[PDB]
């Protein structure tokens, strides 16, 4: 996980069809002392893109990734499916997957304020948590209602078209979600947010 680079080279190449990002903002070593419960350290990290690798080789066809180096990729730090490759000058190059891409945040180099403005990039959808009861007809569980804010494109289609089939959900629809179904987020204004994958998207409500 925390591997040291050799000395005579510093330019890290990605893991083929993966995403290479860098983040050192809003860590433990920061200027803020008073903070929110630990979803504040689970905020959008705003990882700046250094270099993008090649496409997906797979079984014999090149697949695109639909990303640009001029953006700030959000990834989950508790979901340790990545590598923490640190340089000698304090720079830490983090190599994440395409499934770890949460989305883009406008005015990304700030605190957790633009969480309602999160636009997803990979197969994820942003759901606003509605202040209702959790389980009332149970005794087995019951999901909580939620409202869609922003939608993202889905996965790559293996047909001859080669287009990314988007999520059929729309902003403004009522849906359902579970407490262990995705990554929970918290805003200082009191509103809560969650991001689910497209395979966990079941129906509207």
């Amino acid at each position: 996980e925390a591997i040291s680079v050799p000395a005579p080279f510093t330019k890290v190449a990605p893991k083929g069809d993966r995403v290479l990002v860098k983040v050192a903002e809003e860590e433990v070593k920061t200027r803020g002392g008073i903070l929110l419960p630990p979803s504040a350290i689970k905020k959008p990290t705003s990882g700046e893109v250094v270099q993008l690798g090649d496409g997906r080789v797979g079984d014999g066809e090149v697949r695109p990734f639909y990303l640009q180096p001029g953006q700030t990729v959000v990834y989950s730090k508790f979901g340790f499916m990545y590598q923490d490759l640190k340089l000698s000058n304090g720079e830490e190059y983090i190599l994440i997957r395409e499934d770890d891409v949460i989305g883009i945040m406008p005015r990304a180099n700030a605190q957790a304020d633009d969480v309602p403005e999160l636009q997803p990039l990979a197969d994820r959808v942003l759901i606003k948590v509605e202040e209702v009861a959790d389980v009332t007809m149970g005794g087995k569980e019951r999901p909580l209602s939620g409202t869609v804010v922003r939608v993202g494109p889905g996965k790559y289609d293996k047909d001859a078209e080669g287009k990314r089939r988007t999520v059929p959900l729309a902003p403004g629809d009522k849906v359902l979600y579970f407490k262990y179904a995705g990554d929970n987020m918290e805003t200082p204004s009191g509103d809560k947010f969650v991001v689910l994958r497209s395979d966990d998207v079941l129906c509207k409500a």
Partner: protein, 95 residues
């Protein structure tokens, strides 16, 4: 979907079924009160939407189909069983 709102029509990639419960609970004082867990629940489809992402379901409303033993969620709405079945877990109709 069938608890908070009255519009219980699901999305185009799934349908809703109602399993039928038999009277095996009466003979529980002598025998085992229910069947072992198995497939072929023999449920009638309440809402039918044919076209989806996977292969379609050329079936009418009220008919009965076969189900797989996995890849489905279970819920109880108004004292009856409701299983969230996918469109790819359907093999054919029964008699």
């Amino acid at each position: 979907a069938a608890l908070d709102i009255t519009k219980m029509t699901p999305i185009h990639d799934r349908v809703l079924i109602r399993p039928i419960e038999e009277e095996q609970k009466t003979a529980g004082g002598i025998l085992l009160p229910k069947a072992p867990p198995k497939a072929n629940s023999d449920a009638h489809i309440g809402e039918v939407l044919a076209v989806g992402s996977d292969v379609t379901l050329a079936v009418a409303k009220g008919d009965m189909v076969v189900f797989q033993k996995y890849a489905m969620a279970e819920v109880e709405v108004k004292e009856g069983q409701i299983i969230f079945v996918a469109e790819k877990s359907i093999m054919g109709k029964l008699e």
